[PDB]
Paper text:
EBNA1 is the viral encoded DNA binding protein essential for the stable maintenance of the EBV circular genome (referred to as episome) during latent infection. EBNA1 binds with high affinity to viral origin of plasmid replication (OriP) to drive latent cycle DNA replication and genome segregation required to maintain stable episome copy number in proliferating cells. EBNA1 is consistently expressed in all EBV-associated tumors, and is thought to provide a survival function in addition to the maintenance of the viral genome. EBNA1 interacts with numerous host proteins important for DNA replication, episome maintenance, and host survival.
To investigate the potential role of amino-acid polymorphisms in the EBNA1 DNA binding domain that may confer NPC risk, we isolated viral DNA from primary EBV positive NPC in patients from Hong Kong. The EBNA1 DBD was amplified by high-fidelity PCR from the HKNPC6-7 variant 2, subcloned, and sequenced. Several polymorphisms were identified that conform to the high-risk forms found in other NPC derived viral strains, including M81 and C666-1. These include 10 amino acid substitutions most of which were considered conservative, but several potential variations that could alter function, including T585I and T502N. We then solved the X-ray crystal structures of NPC and B95-8 EBNA1 DBDs, as well as their co-crystal structures in complex with a cognate DNA binding site derived from EBV OriP. The structures reveal an overall near-identical fold (RMDS of .219 Å) between NPC and B95-8 EBNA1 DBDs. None of the polymorphic amino acids make direct contact with DNA or altered the DNA binding interface. Amino acids A487V, T585I, T502N, D499E, and R594K are on the exposed EBNA1 surface opposite the DNA binding interface, suggesting that they may alter potential interactions of EBNA1 with other proteins. Amino acids T524I, I528V, and L533I are buried within the protein surface and have no apparent effect on overall structure. The NPC- and B95-8 EBNA1 DBDs were next assayed for DNA binding using BIACORE surface plasmon resonance (SPR) assay with two different DNA probes derived from either a single FR site or the paired DS 3+4 binding sites. Both proteins bound with high affinity (16-17 nM for FR, and 11-14 nM for DS 3+4), although NPC-EBNA1 had a slightly reduced affinity for DS 3+4 relative to B95-8 EBNA1 (14.1 vs 11.9 nM).
Residue numbers in the entry:
A (entry chain B): 459 to 607
B (entry chain A): 461 to 607
Write the structure that this text describes.
DNA sequence: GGATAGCCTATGCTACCC
DNA sequence: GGGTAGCATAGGCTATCC
């Protein structure tokens, strides 16, 4: 029985469906309690949200969800994390060595909404079963902003 | 002519090309012997590098790894679009461009600043596309728990 | 809503060209 | 040291499973 190959939707062209819509609605409810400004007139991307861990699929679905809930943001594809510190006095891994742990980046126009978005993702995720509850989120601040093309 | 050389993702070593870029960086980083590590060892800061071209970004990445053993670096990935100009609707948050980026993780913000300065100065005397590479210092409120 | 199959195509990697 | 070729294997995407 089926199970897909090519569906004519390229990188970044993801549509919607109940699964991603339901995730988005979870975010929207939380976000609606904090009705803060998500845009500025200048429109620069001065803040971000760095999301990682859990599992590839759970991260992916979260990314798809955020996208539907927040048209005012911009989101990278999933990518991978390098390793952290090795314990003890020994040698460390090279800076390029990559792990199995994924991450994605959300860009935002206001610092205020970045904080709220971060809170919402945490709360959305903290009550769900593993691996989704293990998804970590941190606000990310850009000194000079980012010139998204 | 190359195909498979046995080197998987993240395993890249060194050669004259990358070491040359690394030495350029080392000289510049030597302008400011600030602390690059903490006792706690948390990844609280970074630099966000993007633009130029795929290859010039890539080569920079390789060079930084050789010049800065104390950092950790993502693979290259892609940027989503910004604001669309004028009358049209905005692109979806997921739509991706051709512009690449990578992230460097650091344990101190003070060195992030120096690393950024180093990259800008390293790149501004070069021709396009490399001179068009953009850098910003990056700060993680709650840090990043790199595996 | 997480995990997977399976086409498309992205990057990581190296050595070659110049 | 920028652009490339070309294997390996990342992810984006979907429907199907359950």
């Amino acid at each position: 029985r089926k199970k897909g190959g090519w569906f004519g939707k390229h990188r970044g062209q993801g549509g919607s469906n109940p699964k991603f819509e339901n995730i988005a609605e979870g975010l929207r409810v939380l976000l609606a309690r904090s009705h803060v400004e998500r845009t500025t007139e200048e429109g620069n991307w001065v803040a971000g949200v760095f999301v990682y861990g859990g599992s590839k699929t759970s991260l992916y679905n979260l990314r798809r969800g955020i996208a539907l809930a927040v048209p005012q943001c911009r989101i990278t594809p999933l990518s991978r994390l390098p390793f952290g510190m090795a314990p003890g006095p020994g040698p460390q891994p090279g800076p390029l060595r990559e792990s199995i742990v994924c991450y994605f980046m959300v860009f935002l126009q206001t610092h205020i909404f970045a904080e709220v978005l971060k809170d919402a993702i945490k709360d959305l995720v903290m009550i769900k079963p593993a691996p989704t509850c293990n998804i970590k989120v941190t606000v990310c601040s850009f000194d000079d902003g980012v010139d998204l093309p």
